[PDB]
């Protein structure tokens, strides 16, 4: 959520967090190109989660 | 807010099957209601491809309009209009014949 | 365009009436020639095209006064 990310999570702590779920976005774009992805809710979920951490890095 | 939620039990006014005591399963968005047990329909459906089957004639319920049912009272055992005459922290659905809150 | 830098005269239009009133258009241009005017404070000639009615005003008001309010309407001299 967003109330978690406000809670004393600094610039570098959330700045490392973006490079974590870009991996999870990459691995879900590789499995979709191949034939193994049934959890289609996961694919449209990390798009709405990279957007949250980019918002809190402009409001302090 | 709306007179009829999902987990209610109703009776039917002015239909093919009037006076049938029922219970709401699914509410649609064009204020049509699928009441569990009444308004039965039968659909000639082809048996399904892609290693499925449907076979033949299978029943299900067809929805009816929201103006054709009403909240059942179980204290005069007849249909009763409902209202929101009582609200203190929430709009409580309350009957108008007896001024008693529904459950 | 044919305007003056002192008096503000543009060309106007009118007619060219004959002896049977055959109206046709013409332009009334103003007289204006180039001329150099000596100043003393900047001790140099300035050249600007003015009318013959602008020559009469320079001879009346003075050159330094008419150059001043030419600057004080925001123009190039």
């Amino acid at each position: 959520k967003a109330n978690e990310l406000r809670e004393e999570k600094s610039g570098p702590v959330t700045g490392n967090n973006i490079s974590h779920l870009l991996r999870d976005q990459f691995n879900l774009r590789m499995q979709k190109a191949t034939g193994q992805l049934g959890q289609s809710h996961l694919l449209s979920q990390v798009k709405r989660d990279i957007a949250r951490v980019k918002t809190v890095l402009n409001q302090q | 807010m709306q007179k009829i939620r999902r987990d209610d039990e109703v009776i039917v006014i002015a239909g093919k099957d009037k006076g049938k005591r029922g219970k709401v399963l699914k509410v649609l968005a064009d204020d049509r209601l699928v009441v569990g047990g009444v308004n039965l329909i039968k659909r000639h459906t082809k048996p399904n491809p892609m290693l499925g089957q449907q076979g033949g004639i299978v029943e299900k319920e067809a929805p009816l309009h929201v103006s054709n049912v009403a909240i059942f009272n179980t204290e005069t055992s007849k249909a009763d209009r409902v209202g929101f005459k009582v609200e203190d922290g929430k709009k409580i659905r309350v009957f108008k014949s007896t001024q008693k809150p529904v459950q | 365009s044919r305007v003056c830098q002192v008096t503000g005269k543009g060309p106007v239009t009118g007619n060219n009436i004959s002896h049977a009133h055959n109206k046709t258009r013409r332009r009334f241009l103003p007289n204006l020639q180039h001329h150099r005017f000596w100043v003393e404070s900047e001790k140099r000639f300035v050249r600007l095209r003015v009318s013959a009615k602008g020559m009469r005003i320079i001879d009346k008001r003075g050159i330094e006064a008419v150059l001043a309010d030419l600057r004080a309407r925001g123009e190039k001299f």
């Binding site: 590789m30 979709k32 190109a33 191949t34 | - | -």
Partner: protein, 92 residues
């Protein structure tokens, strides 16, 4: 950037001409981003698969156009890159 490595690759492109290509040779066909250069996908393979690649070729594909009622329809055009690796380290 720290980003921009997790954007230029959109998956494999396995088909009849790419299956026989990766076996007789070592060339793997990806479906790269719509505007990427030959350097910034040389780096995103050495990073994301830990293999050394010698050289990369690319090409552009036009989208096929359908013609039904109520106008025409243009499918999305896309780029494509043949990644020619070393004779060892066939990738996954």
């Amino acid at each position: 950037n720290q980003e921009r490595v997790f954007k230029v690759l959109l998956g494999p492109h396995i088909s009849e001409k790419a299956t026989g290509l990766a076996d007789g040779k070592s060339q793997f066909v990806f479906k790269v981003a719509t505007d990427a250069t030959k350097l910034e996908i040389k780096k995103a393979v050495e990073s994301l698969f830990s293999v050394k690649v010698q050289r990369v070729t690319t090409l552009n594909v036009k989208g096929k156009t359908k013609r039904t009622a109520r106008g025409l329809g243009k499918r999305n055009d896309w780029k494509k890159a043949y990644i020619a690796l070393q004779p060892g380290q066939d990738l996954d």
